[PDB]
Design an enzyme around this catalytic site. Structure first.
Site, PDB file in Angstrom:
ATOM      1  N   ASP A 538      32.583  78.462   5.022  1.00 49.79           N
ATOM      2  CA  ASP A 538      33.586  78.870   5.944  1.00 49.79           C
ATOM      3  C   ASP A 538      33.393  80.252   6.095  1.00 49.79           C
ATOM      4  OD1 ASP A 538      34.319  76.216   5.056  1.00 49.79           O
ATOM      5  OD2 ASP A 538      36.987  77.683   4.340  1.00 49.79           O
ATOM      6  N   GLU A 735      35.181  74.063  -8.311  1.00 51.47           N
ATOM      7  CA  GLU A 735      34.965  74.684  -7.096  1.00 51.47           C
ATOM      8  C   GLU A 735      33.470  75.010  -6.573  1.00 51.47           C
ATOM      9  OE1 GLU A 735      37.770  75.313  -4.383  1.00 51.47           O
ATOM     10  OE2 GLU A 735      37.220  75.136  -2.228  1.00 51.47           O
TER      11      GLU A 735
HETATM   12  O1  LIG Z   1      36.950  70.583  -0.110  1.00 48.62           O
HETATM   13  C1  LIG Z   1      36.943  70.301   0.806  1.00 48.62           C
HETATM   14  C2  LIG Z   1      36.310  72.184   2.036  1.00 48.62           C
HETATM   15  C3  LIG Z   1      35.071  72.197   2.327  1.00 48.62           C
HETATM   16  O2  LIG Z   1      34.632  70.808   3.221  1.00 48.62           O
HETATM   17  C4  LIG Z   1      34.086  73.111   2.967  1.00 48.62           C
HETATM   18  O3  LIG Z   1      33.042  72.765   2.410  1.00 48.62           O
HETATM   19  C5  LIG Z   1      34.579  74.017   2.195  1.00 48.62           C
HETATM   20  O4  LIG Z   1      34.399  75.744   2.012  1.00 48.62           O
HETATM   21  C6  LIG Z   1      36.442  74.324   1.902  1.00 48.62           C
HETATM   22  N1  LIG Z   1      36.782  72.755   1.059  1.00 48.62           N
HETATM   23  C7  LIG Z   1      38.359  73.194   0.494  1.00 48.62           C
HETATM   24  C8  LIG Z   1      38.989  73.177   1.586  1.00 48.62           C
HETATM   25  C9  LIG Z   1      40.347  73.579   1.287  1.00 48.62           C
HETATM   26  C10 LIG Z   1      40.637  74.296   0.611  1.00 48.62           C
HETATM   27  C11 LIG Z   1      41.842  75.415   0.493  1.00 48.62           C
HETATM   28  C12 LIG Z   1      43.194  73.653   0.721  1.00 48.62           C
HETATM   29  C13 LIG Z   1      44.614  73.966   0.356  1.00 48.62           C
HETATM   30  C14 LIG Z   1      44.984  75.643   0.322  1.00 48.62           C
HETATM   31  N2  LIG Z   1      46.568  75.930   0.378  1.00 48.62           N
HETATM   32  C15 LIG Z   1      46.608  75.403  -0.873  1.00 48.62           C
HETATM   33  C16 LIG Z   1      47.420  74.532  -0.724  1.00 48.62           C
HETATM   34  C17 LIG Z   1      47.936  73.653  -2.540  1.00 48.62           C
HETATM   35 CL1  LIG Z   1      48.086  72.221  -2.064  1.00 48.62          CL
HETATM   36  C18 LIG Z   1      47.235  74.124  -3.456  1.00 48.62           C
HETATM   37  C19 LIG Z   1      46.331  75.216  -3.907  1.00 48.62           C
HETATM   38  C20 LIG Z   1      46.246  76.523  -5.012  1.00 48.62           C
HETATM   39  N3  LIG Z   1      44.949  77.314  -4.977  1.00 48.62           N
HETATM   40  C21 LIG Z   1      45.089  77.448  -6.736  1.00 48.62           C
HETATM   41  O5  LIG Z   1      46.019  77.399  -6.602  1.00 48.62           O
HETATM   42  N4  LIG Z   1      46.842  77.064  -5.836  1.00 48.62           N
HETATM   43  C22 LIG Z   1      46.652  76.764  -1.922  1.00 48.62           C
HETATM   44  C23 LIG Z   1      42.649  72.988   1.430  1.00 48.62           C
HETATM   45  C24 LIG Z   1      41.478  72.396   1.807  1.00 48.62           C
END
Ligand SMILES: OC[C@@H]1[C@@H](O)[C@H](O)[C@@H](O)CN1CCc1ccc(CCNc2cc(Cl)cc(-c3ncon3)c2)cc1
Length: 765
Positions: A538, A735
Site C-alpha cells: 500500500d 498481519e
Molecule cells: O489482506 C488484504 C489487504 C492486502 O491485499 C494488501 O496487500 C494489504 O496491504 C492490505 N490488506 C488488508 C487490507 C485492509 C486493511 C484494513 C481493513 C479495515 C479498515 N478499517 C477497519 C475495519 C474493521 Cl471491520 C476493523 C478495523 C480494526 N483494525 C484494528 O482494530 N480495528 C479497521 C480492511 C482491509
C-alpha cells in the site's frame, strides 16, 4: 471422466460452515438457499443482552480468541471460542455425512462451558437462526405438544428445488433450564425452548440480529401493554424469552436459555439419503474426522528440524486449520464504476486529481449477481476475497487438497469480465457490504492486483508432470482430468495476461528511453500521492510525484511470472503459436528488467520515473520492491545481480532483522514514516517468496549455493520462530511483525497469508 470428477467434487464440497464472517453458521454453495447461524450472550439485567450477544466475528478486549482447531471442508472440523465478556468457552463441532443426491447431510454440536470467572448460575441465551431464500421453497416448524414451547427437540421440515426434501433438528440438549415462578409464567410458560416462525422479503433474511431484536422488542412491548411493570417485573431472562409461535416461514428463530453449562445438537437430514442423522452419528463422525485430519496433516505437513516438536505441530495445525477454515461462499451484487472515464487512463501529470474528479461523478452501480468460493484473510476485519492474497492462501491449501484449490481458482476466474479484469476485492451482496464503508466498496476496472494465483497454478503443473482422499488429488492422479481443467482455464489466463499489457502498460517510446525491447514496460494504475494500493504494497515509497512515465519493477516481474506459467501451460496444451510469442516476451522482459530497472550504483532493482527534464531516472528505495526479480524467480542462479541482491538481503543494516526481512531498509529516508504499513514491518508473504527462492539457489550447483543455504536456514528459522512465539504468547496470527521488537502488530486473526508458516516449516520446496 473430467465431468465425473467435477460432479463428485460438487457433491463433496456443497455444504460447509461457509459463513466465516460469523462465529458459527452454515450455508451450501448456492446463492439463494438455506442458511443457519448461532448467537449467544449472558443476560444479567434488563438491558445488557443487546450488548453481550455474539453473532458476527469481532476481536477486542472482551474476546480472548477463537478459531478452528481442525478443519477440512469435505469433512468438517472443530472450532473453539474463548469469550471473556460472556464468561464462556464454546466448542462448535461440524461434520458432514455424504449420501443422497443433494450434497449430503451434516450435524453440529454446540457446547458451552462457563469459565472459572463466570457466576456459576449465569444465564446464557442461545439462538439458532434459520433462514431460507427462494420463491418455490418451504420451511415449517412442527408445533410443540406443550402449551408454551418445547420440552424436547425442535423439528423443521423444509423443501427446495436445490435441496429436495430435508429436515433440520435442534435437539433438546443438556443443561439446566431456569424456571420462573412469576405470574407471567401462566401465559408464557415457566421457561422452555421456543420457536418463532416468521417471514420477511428474502433480501433481508441475512440481517439476523435486527430481526431477532425486533421480535424481542415486540415481546417487551406486549409486557408493557399487559401490565407487567417495575413494581413486580419478571426476571430478565424471562423478559427476553420470545413468545412461542412456530409455523411456516422463511425465518425460524430457535431460542433456549440455560443456567450453567450447556450443549445441544443440530441435525440436518437430506431426505434423499439413508435414514435420518442422529446424535450418535454426529459423535462417531466427529471422532472419525479428527482421526483422518491427524493422518493427513502428518503426511502433507511433515515439519522439519528444528520444528518437529509437538509444540510446533500444534502451532502448525492451528495456523493451517484457521487458513482453510476461513473458506466461505459469497453471493450477491458488487459495486462497480463501469464509466471507463478517460481520467482513469492516467496519461497526464497530476492524474490523481482528475481520477478523483471522475470518482466524484459517482457513476458506480450494482451489478451481478456473482458468487465466489474462496478462503479469506481476516474473519473479524475483512472476511472476503482479495485477489493477490488468495494466491498465497492456496499454496498450503493445494498441498492439503489440490482439487479444493483448483475449485477456488476456478471460482475466481469465473468472475473475470470480457476484457480480462477481476476486481481485486470481492464484496458480494448486502451482507458482505455491511462490513465495508460505502467509500471503499466501489471497484474500478483499471485496478489490477498481483497475479499470485499463477503461483498456485505453477505448483499444480509441476505435480501434474511429476473417496474424500481420492477426490482431493483426482486432478493430478488423472492427467487427462488435470489437462482438461487447464484447457478450459487457459483462455482466461491468457485473457488476463493481455489485459495487464493493455491496461497496465508503461511508456518507453514517448521519452528518451533506450532498452532492448520497446514494448516491455509496466506501470500500476490507481496510484495516489502516498499510495499504490493495486500493487498490494500500500504505502511502499514510490517515485514522487506519481507520473505517467513511472515504471514499476514489481509489476514487470509479475508479468514475468505470468508468461512463464503461460509457457508451461501452453506447452502442455500444444499451443505452439502462443508459446513462441510468450517466449519472445520473456526474453524481452529479462533484458528490459536490467535496462530500465537495474541500478549499478545502488546494487539492486529500482522503480523508475521521468525527471523535471523529461529524462529517465531510477528511484531507489531498498526493500521488498528492490528484490522483486529475485522473489518472482526471474534470475539465473549465477546472475551477478542475484549475488548483490543476496548481499542486500543478508545485510543487517538494511533488510535483515532477527525476525525476518524488513519491508523497507532502515537506511531508507522513509523507514518507519507515515502509517508505516509497508515501510519497515516484516510481512510473511514476501518473506515466504524469499525463503522459497533462497532454497532454490541452495539446492542447485552454482556460485551462491552456500550463501543461499545459510540465508535459507536462518530466514526460515527467524520467520517461523517469530510467528510461533507470537502465537504462543497471544493465540493469534498477526498481519505483520515488528522488526525491532518481534511483536505482532496491525490486525489479529490474519490467516491470511501469515499461515504460510506451515509450508515454510514443511520445507522441501
Ligand atoms: O489482506 C488484504 C489487504 C492486502 O491485499 C494488501 O496487500 C494489504 O496491504 C492490505 N490488506 C488488508 C487490507 C485492509 C486493511 C484494513 C481493513 C479495515 C479498515 N478499517 C477497519 C475495519 C474493521 Cl471491520 C476493523 C478495523 C480494526 N483494525 C484494528 O482494530 N480495528 C479497521 C480492511 C482491509
Amino acid at each position: 471422466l473430467h465431468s465425473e470428477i467435477g460432479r463428485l467434487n460438487n457433491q463433496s464440497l456443497l455444504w460447509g460452515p461457509y459463513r466465516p464472517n460469523i462465529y458459527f453458521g452454515t450455508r451450501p454453495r448456492i446463492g439463494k438457499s438455506l442458511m443457519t447461524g448461532l448467537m449467544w450472550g449472558k443476560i444479567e439485567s434488563y438491558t445488557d443482552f443487546q450488548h453481550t450477544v455474539r453473532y458476527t466475528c469481532e476481536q477486542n478486549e472482551g474476546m480472548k480468541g477463537y478459531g478452528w482447531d481442525e478443519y477440512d471442508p469435505r469433512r468438517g472440523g472443530i472450532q473453539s471460542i474463548h469469550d471473556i465478556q460472556n464468561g464462556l468457552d464454546i466448542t462448535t463441532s461440524f461434520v458432514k455425512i455424504p449420501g443422497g443426491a443433494h450434497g449430503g447431510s451434516w450435524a453440529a454440536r454446540i457446547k458451552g462451558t462457563l469459565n472459572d470467572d463466570a457466576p456459576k448460575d449465569q444465564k446464557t441465551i442461545v439462538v439458532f437462526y434459520v433462514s431460507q431464500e427462494g420463491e418455490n421453497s418451504e420451511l415449517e416448524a412442527v408445533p410443540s405438544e406443550n402449551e408454551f414451547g418445547y420440552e424436547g427437540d425442535v423439528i423443521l421440515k423444509g423443501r427446495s428445488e436445490a435441496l429436495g426434501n430435508y429436515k433440520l433438528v435442534v435437539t433438546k440438549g443438556k443443561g439446566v433450564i431456569p424456571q420462573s415462578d412469576h405470574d407471567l409464567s401462566r401465559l408464557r410458560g415457566p421457561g422452555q425452548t421456543v420457536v418463532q416462525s416468521l417471514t420477511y422479503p428474502d433480501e433481508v433474511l441475512w440481517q439476523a440480529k435486527p430481526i431477532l431484536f425486533q421480535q424481542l422488542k415486540a415481546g417487551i412491548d406486549w409486557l408493557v401493554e399487559n401490565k407487567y411493570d417495575v413494581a413486580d417485573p419478571p426476571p430478565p431472562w424471562q423478559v427476553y424469552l420470545l413468545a412461542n409461535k412456530p409455523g411456516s416461514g422463511n425465518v425460524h428463530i430457535v431460542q433456549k436459555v440455560f443456567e450453567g453449562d450447556f450443549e445441544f445438537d443440530i441435525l440436518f437430514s437430506s431426505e434423499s439419503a439413508g435414514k435420518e442423522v442422529t446424535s450418535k452419528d454426529l459423535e462417531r463422525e466427529v471422532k472419525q474426522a479428527t482421526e483422518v485430519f491427524g493422518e493427513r496433516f502428518a503426511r502433507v505437513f511433515d515439519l522439519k528440524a528444528p520444528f518437529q516438536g509437538d509444540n510446533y505441530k500444534k502451532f502448525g495445525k492451528s495456523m493451517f486449520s484457521n487458513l482453510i477454515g476461513g473458506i466461505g461462499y459469497f453471493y450477491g451484487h458488487s459495486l462497480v464504476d463501469r464509466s471507463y472515464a478517460p481520467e482513469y487512463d492516467e496519461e497526464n501529470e497530476g492524474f490523481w486529481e482528475d481520477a478523483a474528479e471522475a470518482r466524484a461523478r459517482h457513476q458506480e452501480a450494482l451489478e451481478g449477481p456473482y458468487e465466489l468460493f474462496t478462503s479469506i484473510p481476516s474473519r473479524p476485519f475483512f472476511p472476503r476475497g482479495f485477489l493477490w492474497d488468495e494466491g498465497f492462501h492456496l499454496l498450503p491449501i493445494a498441498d492439503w487438497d489440490i482439487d479444493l484449490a483448483l475449485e477456488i481458482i476456478k471460482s475466481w476466474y469465473n468472475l473475470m469480465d470480457e476484457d480480462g479484469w477481476i476486481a481485486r476485492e470481492q464484496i458480494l451482496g448486502a451482507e458482505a457490504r455491511s462490513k465495508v464503508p460505502k467509500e471503499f466498496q466501489t471497484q474500478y476496472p483499471h485496478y489490477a492486483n498481483p497475479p499470485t494465483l499463477f503461483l498456485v497454478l505453477d505448483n499444480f503443473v509441476e505435480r501434474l508432470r511429476k473417496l474424500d482422499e481420492t477426490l482431493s488429488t483426482a486432478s493430478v492422479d488423472n492427467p487427462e482430468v488435470g489437462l482438461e481443467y487447464l484447457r478450459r482455464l487457459y483462455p482466461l489466463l491468457r485473457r488476463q495476461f493481455d489485459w495487464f499489457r493493455k491496461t497496465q502498460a508503461g511508456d518507453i517510446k514517448s521519452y528518451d528511453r533506450e532498452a532492448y525491447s520497446t514494448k516491455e514496460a509496466y506501470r500500476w494504475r490507481g496510484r495516489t500521492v502516498s499510495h499504490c494500493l493495486t500493487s498490494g504494497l500500500d504505502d511502499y515509497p514510490r517515485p514522487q510525484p506519481p507520473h505517467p512515465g513511472e515504471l514499476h519493477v514489481d509489476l514487470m516481474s509479475w508479468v514475468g511470472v505470468m508468461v512463464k506459467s503461460l509457457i508451461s501451460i501452453g506447452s502442455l496444451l500444444g499451443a505452439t503459436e502462443d508459446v513462441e510469442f510468450y517466449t519472445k516476451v520473456l526474453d524481452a522482459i529479462e533484458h528490459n528488467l536490467d535496462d530500465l530497472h537495474w541500478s549499478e550504483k545502488e546494487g539492486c532493482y529500482c522503480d523508475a520515473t521521468i525527471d523535471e527534464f523529461e529524462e529517465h531516472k531510477l528511484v531507489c528505495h531498498k526493500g521488498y520492491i528492490s528484490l522483486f526479480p529475485f522473489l518472482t524467480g526471474l534470475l539465473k542462479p549465477d546472475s551477478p545481480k542475484l549475488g548483490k541482491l543476496l548481499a542486500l538481503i543478508g545485510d543487517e543494516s538494511e533488510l535483515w532483522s532477527p525476525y525476518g526481512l524488513r519491508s523497507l531498509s532502515k537506511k531508507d529516508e522513509f523507514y518507519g514514516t507515515a502509517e508505516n504499513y509497508w515501510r519497515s514491518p516484516v510481512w510473511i508473504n514476501i518473506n515466504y517468496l524469499a525463503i522459497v527462492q533462497l532454497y532454490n539457489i541452495a539446492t542447485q550447483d552454482g556460485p551462491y549455493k552456500e550463501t543461499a543455504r545459510d540465508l535459507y536456514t536462518r530466514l526460515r528459522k527467524n520467520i517461523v520462530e517469530t510467528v510461533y512465539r507470537n502465537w504462543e504468547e497471544t493465540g493469534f496470527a498477526w498481519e505483520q511483525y515488528n522488526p525491532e521488537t518481534g511483536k505482532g502488530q496491525r490486525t489479529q486473526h490474519f490467516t491470511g497469508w501469515t499461515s504460510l508458516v506451515v509450508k515454510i516449516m514443511s520445507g522441501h520446496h
